[PDB]
Amino acid sequence: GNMSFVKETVDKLLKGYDIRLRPDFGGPPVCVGMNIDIASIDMVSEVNMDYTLTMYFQQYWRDKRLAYSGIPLNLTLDNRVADQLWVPDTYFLNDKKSFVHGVTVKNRMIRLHPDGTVLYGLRITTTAACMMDLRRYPLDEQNCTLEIESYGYTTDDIEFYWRGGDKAVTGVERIELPQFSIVEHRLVSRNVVFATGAYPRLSLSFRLKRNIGYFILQTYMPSILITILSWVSFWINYDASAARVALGITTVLTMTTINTHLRETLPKIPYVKAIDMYLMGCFVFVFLALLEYAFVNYIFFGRDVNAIDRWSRIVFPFTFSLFNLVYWLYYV
Amino acid sequence: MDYTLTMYFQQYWRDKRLAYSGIPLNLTLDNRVADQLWVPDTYFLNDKKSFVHGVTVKNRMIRLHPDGTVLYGLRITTTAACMMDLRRYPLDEQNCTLEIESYGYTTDDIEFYWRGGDKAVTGVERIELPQFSIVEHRLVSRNVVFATGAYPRLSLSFRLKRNIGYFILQTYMPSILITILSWVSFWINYDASAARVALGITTVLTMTTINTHLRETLPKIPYVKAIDMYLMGCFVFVFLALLEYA
């Protein structure tokens, strides 16, 4: 390692290198193996319907032009060498905005091997679209994907595959999403046909199951508590008009306020969610409580109060428990 | 789940190629000469977004020495992820770290150490931020392992203790005083159903609103926390106060 022979070798690897031409131009296609090391998934936004992903993206191919003899060890060159080499035109099809980290330097790896093999690594943060089905929200289970494709070259010129097969993607255990948990992940390889031709594609899919604890602590519990507060009106004597109507008006106002607060933090989807069904059920329950008091007031003075009051007291908890049981069995 | 941090980051390394003699002074060259020199491929592993400041010029330092030592300086503002255990919130104590690693070079090619020992990192004592206090900071050096090989790592860790003065005068004390005011219903006469029931429903609505104002600045976490337990306890107290008159 006199360090001048290395410079000569690297120089004559270049000096006749055309970056405009892929390896084996006009020959068989270049096989580019790919592997990913996931660092984290920072965000999963229902409003924007996308997720942010940070990863180490490693591509691996062979270029006979970059073959050297002599030096029997792998050359870990400076990342700037990547500017003077052909690299695959890989891109993420469903990305919305992505960048390569650039502090302190451009986070790039170039590693050559004596047989012309090239290992090219990047550190990429990317926001990727993920259409979500919120019909069963918040007891929903989403499928998100990252689609890797060649922009310029068809299958006649380039081919993609996963290095190590199912072991190509690592770091799935590193994900720490407070709202979600990754049930499963999958790798797929295929060819997609366009007007211009057939292009390679790789797909990395994740299945995310949402955690229900936050919505138990936020949505369901206040609704149940307000419904019970509505039930409290039945125990008060019938003659207390102000006391008995106050409970009804505050229950319905609180339920509507909960509805607005809940619906003003999600996309304006046109269909009904599970949370909407439960919320409307609780609303009609407090509504029936208020109308029960109104009907009693109409019956007694201004037209048995004890019998109907006792019947309401025994039946309302039973009916609400039955409704909750039916709902929770339906959505679980 | 992130902390922003501005810092002067300095690296020192010996290079025989850049050794000169006959000049008895250290040479401070223009920063753009860094484009013509090898520099280590250092990066921050837990980074989310960072940049080097560029006014009036790129805030960069290159300084050579006669023996061959090169001092390379940058001014970096970086946002770094810091997972937080908000179980004892706001009585929690967080551990936020910055991990520094070589991107390309394994331990066979490059080696990291903290220059100056434990006094490598300075200016931490002078930091002041409202919500937290830096109890302690630590420096660690390691050799992590991957499939490609073994890589150096440095770690600058801080322990942050949240100052519980804002929540005392926004969350705990209003909820407490609402609870004592809810207790006023007991002293009122029994036959004044309108007044007692009005007080009860107003206190319960108050507790629900104070619960709603919380948890907006907080993440969407599944588990319960200390402030949630306190608010639930006060809510149960006012609810039982209303059920008492019922």
Epitope: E173 | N46, V144, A147
Partner: nanobody, 108 residues
Framework: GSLRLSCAAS????????MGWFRQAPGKEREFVGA????????SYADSVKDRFTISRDNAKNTVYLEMNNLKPEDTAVYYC??????????????????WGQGTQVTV
Amino acid sequence: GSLRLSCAASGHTFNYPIMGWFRQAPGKEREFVGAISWSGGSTSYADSVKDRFTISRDNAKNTVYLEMNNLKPEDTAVYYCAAKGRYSGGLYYPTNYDYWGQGTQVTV
């Protein structure tokens, strides 16, 4: 039959989200068996223990269970449980794990 090992942790477990089972027989270094995350939904296994051993995580109790079915003569070894930090990198390499268990023996 089947053997169920359990490893319980106590301390600053939040800073060490990843938990991992390793195995060591005499005359050879400790080898990776499996790994489990903080949430517990993501699990990893060695190549030669697929579908024979299984790992689960019980939070609150703060325990990890390794249930071992259809044991084999080569399974005789000392089994360890170890914890790994948030930014260590590499499940299969024991040097990335800071804290180790006791090494409970298993013979079949």
